[PDB]
Structure 1
């Protein structure tokens, strides 16, 4: 970010020669690369035009090739497959699942705002419909994220006895994602695999942690509220050879790149991020140098919801990064047409853009 205070803090330094170390030069848009090359070369580079995927123009491809040939000696990249030829392959699978009836009625209550129906049995009635997209993501993830929502499911269909058995059934059947998650957990439990689950919101991490606590599965958790000492304890307990832990939950944007997950095999992305580099560093926690097993990624996507255009923007950013960054290490019209188009033995742990 050019307007971030670190940019004016570092750009005012009297430095002859600078150098930037990163892994993801492109994250969201070309303005990030423009700010980076303005920090490197002040005034020499004048990247101003954006990239329109729904244009299909030859001058845009000429601009793309100019952006390729301009930064050839200034960018050095080495992939993890070009060097150290022993890395197991990493496969990601996108799973689209039907919504539940509770998820559907919360979605139509949010999208077609129904404040009288949204309060209903809540005594406080403090439902905030600011950030409509955030509420749609919450409804696509789990109905229990909303306040005063569990007791309506429990008293009407689960009979409200709450005798340690119907609550797990309510958490399983309330969301359309946790039935597939429960099937995946049973399949990875009957096989020899350990699974990490990444989430954007720590309240969904609380939901999964309570589900695994009442399930009887030895789970571990890491988020921003956990201090670094307990994070070190959790990582050393999960990476121990005598570990009884099976599933490890992560908040996606925490801890940086210094987190060690050698013993992991399966990565489940519960919530897709707007920045695909965040998801790349999410399933790159287990897919580092030295992994002894085939890393498999399951992405849990709600059907016909707000997350589909989230994946559309994520794939557009991935197409942009594969165009400019991945082709300028150390068919452009084909990948532009691939990025311009809309996209929209099933859980087997076995197996250019």
Structure 2
């Protein structure tokens, strides 16, 4: 849907072009392979007691997610470069209030600086990866601040066999470089340094691309070998599975009552 005149083809080829308030959400979910995983994650995190930030590199994709949560009916708040600083302060204070009904808070990844406090959220969904891994690290550190009362869980959404593979490969190489120079020069191991630098350079010369949505987790060199694994997700969800009988009854009653009240 980021391309112009692409929603019309999906609507006229699947929902036969009527666009009657239910097939639009189906087209939004089933047009992209990230959106089915995003919908399953959103339902699972709404089922639990979690709040989620969602980071994107494009503000048009933020518009797409905002429309998805508008037709979906989820109290969301948003922040990008178009929002001025007063409404930014209002939105950040509204999300961090103890009586907040907001569930998901959308960001453009490079906006807001380093001074955004996102204390109350727990899950961070990196929808689009950055070329610079420090931008994604700051995005994760928006919620992973000092004094956080919950185990922060980060889900990175990757399109399989696409151009995002080399985006993650370049990000992994830059993290390897930062762990090499910066992390090993902070503030009998000199003999094992000649082995473990060779090990991390063999990691840097290797391609990373050869109970799944659990919000839980049960020496320092092996810690860096984590969070580079790839967990392949298969949906196999057809057109009529989404919008179940609870959601379809709520969507049809709201559409029927809208014609009675006109407006």
Shorter-chain TM band = 0.7 to 0.9
Q: Which has the higher contact order (CA 8 A, sep 6+)?
A: 1
Quick one: which of 214, 237, 244 aligns to 1:348?
214
Superposition deviation, residue 279 in structure 1: 0.3
TM-score (norm 2): 0.79
Superposition deviation, residue 153 in structure 1: 0.5
The residue that corresponds to 1:28 in the other structure is none
The residue that corresponds to 2:259 in the other structure is none
The residue that corresponds to 2:48 in the other structure is 191
Unaligned 5+ runs, structure 1: 1-143
- Encode CA deviations 1:160-194: one digit per residue, 9 max, x unaligned: 11111110000000000000000000000000000
Establish whether residue 332 from structure 1 lines up as the match of residue 189 from structure 2.
Answer: no
The residue that corresponds to 2:175 in the other structure is 318
Residue pairs, 1:1-353, within 5 angstroms: 144-330=1-187, 331-344=196-209, 345-351=211-217, 352=222, 353=224
Structure 1 stretches (4+) deviating beyond 2 angstroms?
Answer: none
Superposition deviation, residue 156 in structure 1: 1.2
Aligned residues: 210
TM-score (norm 1): 0.59
Asked which structure has the greater CA Rg, the reply is: 1
Separation in 2 of the partners of 1:274 and 1:246? 28
Unaligned 5+ runs, structure 2: 188-195, 225-263
Separation in 2 of the partners of 1:255 and 1:245? 19
Superposition deviation, residue 343 in structure 1: 1.0
